[PDB]
Request: fold
Amino acid sequence: YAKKRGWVLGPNNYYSFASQQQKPEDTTIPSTELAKQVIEYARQLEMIV
Amino acid sequence: IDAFRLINANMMVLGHEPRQTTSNLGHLNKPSIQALIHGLNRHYYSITINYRKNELEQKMLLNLHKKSWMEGLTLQDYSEHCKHNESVVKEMLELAKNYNKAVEEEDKMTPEQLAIKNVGKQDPKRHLEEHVDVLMTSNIVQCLAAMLDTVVFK
Reply:
């Protein structure tokens, strides 16, 4: 596991790499696809005509 | 508006507006009872009116009256929009209270498909969905109008 992956034994301590990202801010990706979902409602509130 | 036109009194033994050339003179004017009592048709007669409509006068007449720029992309100011939807849900609530008893009692007592629930009624399945029809068009537009400015205005 030390030669393939990380887990480097140093001063009697392993070190596994780790992070995280952040995304609550994007109202923009539910802006385009929601606009598609609202129109395809109103497309189908008519058109069997 | 109407236009009239005097006929001579000497030609009262022959035709007055005679000599049928066409057959379009019958559906362009139908004189009502209040018109044929004063002078029609022994004194004067009526004449047909059409409207000389052309371009660069008629199209620009509507290119300036019933037009808009920002009316589509403008919010309905939710202080009274969702306040309006309160008084629409509550009234179709009462029509749904009215709808529950009405049809099912009528069908289970007598199957006549007829009288006083046919001659002078107003609570069919014509009244309960037009409030739903107004409530969609007022909101599906209003939902989608607030979707554009999220993309367009950053």
Remarks:
- Strands of chain B lie at 3-6, 44-47.
- Chain B touches chain A at residues 136, 140, 143-144, 147-148, 150-151 (CB under 8 Å).
- Helices of chain B lie at 59-62, 81-109, 130-152.
- The CA atoms of residues 51 and 58 of chain B lie 11 Å apart.
